[PDB]
Amino acid sequence: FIVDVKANKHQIKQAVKKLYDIDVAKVNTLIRPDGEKKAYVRLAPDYDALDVANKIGII
């Protein structure tokens, strides 16, 4: 995801859980040279990333 720069991993994990109804294992954070924050959100083993991506519409 691309997230707000003023957002830590706790806020990112809670948000992804709230609007997508999924469980998060861990979150990794990066700030790109563009200036925006990139979050790598690994999901729990029960949830499938491809199925979640289909429901969101990114694939």
Binding site: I31, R32, P33, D34, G35
Partner: protein, 50 residues
């Protein structure tokens, strides 16, 4: 260097995003006078104020 502060990185981010060419449809706007981006900056030629 790799070791940089957040303030410097955000400053370099902005200069990176504003180093783009003029869009093509701007030339078609009524009463247009811009032909190219005259503020293009090359890293080797001109150095940043920082």
């Amino acid at each position: 260097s790799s070791h940089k502060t957040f303030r410097i990185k955000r400053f370099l981010a902005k200069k990176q995003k504003q180093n783009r060419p003029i869009p093509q449809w701007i030339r078609m706007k009524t009463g247009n006078k811009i032909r190219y981006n005259s503020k293009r900056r090359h890293w080797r030629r001109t150095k940043l104020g920082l």
